[PDB]
Design a protein around this ligand. Structure first.
Ligand SMILES: Nc1ncnc2c1ncn2[C@@H]1O[C@H](COP(=O)(O)OP(=O)(O)OP(=O)(O)O)[C@@H](O)[C@H]1O
Ligand SMILES: [Mg+2]
Ligand SMILES: [Mg+2]
Lengths: 356, 457
């Protein structure tokens, strides 16, 4: 089936501007045997991990391969992949590198810090490491920047051969490269490049152009995959618009009784600013008694209506303190909606006026 | 143990097929809770109604077809996806996913889709938040490792292992908000594995709020879940009607053989017919949907209404435990009135004079200064001030000898039982202070409902 292979889907498309800059950093560190640290930043979704994994899976003591120099030579290059979030402690990052480079047949030594790791790379061979997400290495200013500062000094001194290529998330400083996000024309080329192995293309050229500009890479994959599951569940240009609309509305989904309490919640926050659940219940009772419409409700059932607004996403209830003489812990009520859409939905029924 | 899966074999190609191993993917406490019965359980005509109304899919059509279609396009195609389920607590979130896995298990036996393994991981059913790695590794591999060894073993298995020697794994992430930690390392690892090529892992996350990744999680974990989210809308008034009628389809409007000796009813000696009024179902499902739309609340209302009617039916006849039974609207209305009522008002009206005087003295101090924070020394001075109002009259001095001397000449004029009583009842509050004069006293309940109890005395 053509619908099963489409939903499942060394130069990456829309990335030739940064691929040449990445390979240029290794042309001076393996050929000249110089240690240097690299820093890669950018927002999540720019394809940083997919770019580094493609180079190792193409043009690249366990874990030993060969790298092709531009002039034409051969060198023993060891490339490994170690994630920072997939560890237990940030201070034990030196032991994982030893297990990924040293063979299992030899003796397994224990590494404590820099003094135990620098002596191992002295006799040796270009050791390439890929530290993904280096922002989590800090200890959540003096003791926080300790693992990053120690790893940077290990890949800066000579006499050894250790390169460092990290991929963070947005005179011995690393080369910072900002990953530019994909635009409308950049996201459209990757779609045709990834689906080039498929014989038939059921997508329209005008539908991918709309999803590429509205998402400006992980967000685009969820949009195209959702259009296939929707079309196959009911049996084009309109297929791309249904994925952005299926994922004023929160007010019409409520009852008339819940709208009366909600109208009194925002009213109490205007003439009193900071208000609690006990003060909001007293303002709602005295507001409906002057109109003499609808039966009142007890304080025990007052929290049931506010729970509906919290689940939908209209009233945020937090726990703070007071500001007066009795500064005790109390439950405060707050909102997070716009005043333009609030004064337009309740006015269409033409049944409530003093409650707004 | 402490050895991860990366050091179990020699290389990548040296790993054999995991599907032909009698240990991967699952390849004694039900006998001690059994005893012999030396009597006979007499079941009345209302016993079968309560058992069918218990929690142990006609109102879910679009939600059941969306989850089933998301997994059918990934298991057969050998891919990985992430399904997000959010809604009100009690709308059939876990039951909808359980029906999808149960429907996919029947299609796998017909040689249509490849075999998969269903893993149920609940966040609230675990003591430590890091215990989810040991449960998943024990159901897939079969070994017993720690939280640090199971985390590194799942990463090496969901990446370097090819698809020709793997198998689809369906993991239901029940209670997604329970696994939220501070470092956000467990939540990110469970969603990053679905983005890998050689993964074949189906993750179905079930939470309670649609804006959970946008409030607790960051931009990195939100981009790995997906933009398409399934919102489980609560049940209204026309959907809860067929839910109760389905559980009591073969019991409603049916004749029973209730015995006049013991009270045992046999579903097809008198021919007692059980019928439940349709108006009692409409007035009960409308009140449930107007509060939160809980599916368990709609079944508990009819169960509580049948329990009250069964109590009056057994007491009027004298049966025991060892013409037409019609459940009117009175039993349903009484089942909802026992919960919406407030017992705080009637609690203060049955207190003693010493407990009622402390509440009346606290409310009078609030109308003089208006600070909502009266000290303990002001309540004592206000109580004595109300006693000396008419001290010259013989009608008021009769209570002064008891509250200050207990009717004894040897007992001196006093200046703790009613103070600590209201503190444990959730009505009165007291700050942590070593002094008994400047200690502020605050009210926890409302002020409107507190004045109604003082006027009733
Ligand atoms: N269509 C239905 N008909 C009858 N009962 C239903 C139906 N849908 C759901 N239920 C009931 O809903 C109950 C709760 O289901 P589920 O485990 O999915 O809960 P939930 O929505 O995740 O929330 P919570 O368990 O936190 O209240 C089940 O015990 C089941 O009996
Ligand atoms: Mg990445
Ligand atoms: Mg559940």
């Amino acid at each position: 089936s053509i619908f099963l292979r489409t939903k499942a889907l060394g130069a990456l498309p829309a990335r030739t501007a940064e691929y040449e800059q990445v390979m240029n950093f290794l042309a001076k560190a393996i050929s000249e045997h110089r240690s240097d640290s690299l820093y890669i930043t950018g927002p999540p979704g720019t394809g940083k991990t997919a770019q580094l994994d493609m180079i190792i899976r193409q043009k690249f003591l366990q874990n030993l391969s060969w790298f092709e120099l531009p002039d034409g030579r051969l060198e023993s290059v060891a490339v490994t992949s170690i994630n920072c979030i997939s560890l237990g402690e940030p201070s034990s990052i030196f032991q994982k590198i030893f297990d990924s480079f040293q063979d299992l047949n030899g003796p397994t030594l224990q590494i404590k810090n820099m003094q135990h790791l620098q002596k191992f790379l002295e006799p040796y061979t270009t050791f390439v490491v890929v530290l993904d997400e280096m922002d989590r290495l800090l200890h959540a200013e003096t003791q926080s920047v300790r693992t990053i500062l120690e790893l940077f000094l290990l890949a800066k001194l000579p006499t050894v051969s250790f390169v460092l290529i990290g991929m963070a998330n947005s005179g011995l400083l690393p080369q910072t490269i900002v990953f530019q996000p994909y635009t409308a024309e950049q996201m459209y080329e990757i779609v045709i490049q990834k689906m080039s192995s498929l014989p038939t293309i059921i997508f329209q050229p005008m539908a991918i152009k709309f999803a590429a500009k509205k998402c400006a890479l992980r967000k685009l994959f969820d949009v195209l995959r959702g259009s296939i599951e929707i079309y196959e569940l009911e049996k084009g240009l309109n297929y791309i618009a249904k994925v952005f609309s299926k994922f004023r509305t929160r007010i019409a989904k409520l009852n008339i009784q819940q709208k009366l309490i909600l109208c009194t919640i925002i009213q109490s926050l205007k003439l009193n600013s900071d208000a609690t659940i006990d003060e909001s219940f007293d303002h709602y009772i005295k507001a409906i008694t002057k109109t003499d419409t609808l039966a009142p409700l007890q304080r025990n059932e007052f929290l049931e209506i506010c729970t509906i607004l919290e689940t939908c996403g209209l009233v945020s209830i937090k726990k703070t303190k007071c500001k007066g003489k009795t500064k005790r812990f109390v439950d405060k009520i707050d909102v997070d909606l716009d005043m333009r859409e609030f004064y337009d939905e309740m006015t269409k029924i033409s049944i409530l006026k003093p409650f707004l | 143990k402490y050895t991860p899966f990366s050091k179990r074999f020699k290389s990548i190609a040296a790993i054999p097929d995991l599907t032909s191993l009698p240990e991967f993917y699952g390849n004694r406490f039900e006998n001690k809770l059994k005893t012999t019965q030396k009597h006979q359980i007499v079941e009345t005509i209302f016993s079968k109604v309560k058992k069918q109304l218990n929690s142990s899919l006609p109102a879910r059509e679009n939600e059941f077809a969306s989850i089933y279609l998301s997994a059918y396009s990934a298991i057969e195609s050998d891919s990985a996806t992430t399904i997000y389920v959010a809604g009100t607590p009690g709308v059939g979130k876990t039951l909808t996913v359980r029906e999808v896995v149960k429907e996919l298990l029947s299609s796998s036996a017909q040689r249509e889709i490849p075999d998969f393994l269903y893993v149920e991981i609940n966040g609230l059913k675990m003591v430590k938040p890091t215990d989810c790695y040991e449960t998943l590794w024990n159901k897939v591999s079969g070994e017993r490792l720690t939280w640090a060894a199971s985390m590194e073993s799942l990463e090496f298995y969901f990446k370097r292992v090819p698809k020709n020697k793997k198998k689809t794994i369906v993991v239901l992430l029940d209670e997604l908000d329970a696994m939220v930690t501070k470092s956000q390392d467990i939540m990110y690892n469970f969603f990053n594995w679905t983005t890998y090529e050689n993964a074949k892992l189906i993750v179905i996350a079930v939470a309670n709020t649609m804006d959970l990744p946008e409030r607790q999680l960051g931009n990195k974990i939100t981009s790995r879940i997906g933009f398409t989210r399934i919102m489980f809308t609560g049940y209204t008034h026309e959907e809860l009607k067929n839910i109760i009628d389905l559980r009591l389809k073969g019991l409603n409007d049916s004749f029973f053989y209730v015995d006049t000796k013991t009270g045992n009813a046999i579903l097809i000696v008198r021919k007692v017919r059980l019928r439940m009024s349709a108006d009692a179902i409409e007035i009960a499902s409308r009140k449930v949907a107007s509060v939160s739309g809980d599916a368990r609340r709609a079944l508990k209302v009819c169960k509580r209404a049948a329990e009250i009617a069964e109590k009056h039916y057994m007491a009027k006849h004298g049966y025991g435990y060892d013409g037409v039974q019609t459940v009117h609207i009175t039993h349903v209305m009484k089942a909802l009135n026992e919960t919406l009522n407030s017992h705080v008002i009637t609690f203060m009206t049955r207190l003693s004079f010493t407990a009622k005087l402390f509440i009346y003295a606290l409310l009078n101090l609030m109308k003089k200064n208006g600070s909502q924070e009266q000290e303990l020394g002001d309540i004592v001075d206000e109580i004595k001030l109300l006693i000396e109002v008419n001290g010259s009259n013989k009608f008021v001095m009769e209570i002064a000898k008891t509250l200050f001397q207990q009717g004894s000449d040897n007992i001196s004029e006093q200046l703790d039982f009613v103070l600590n009583q209201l503190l444990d009842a959730g009505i009165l509050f007291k700050q942590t202070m070593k002094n008994d004069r400047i200690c502020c006293v605050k009210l926890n309940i409302s002020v409107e409902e507190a004045k109604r109890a003082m006027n009733e005395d």
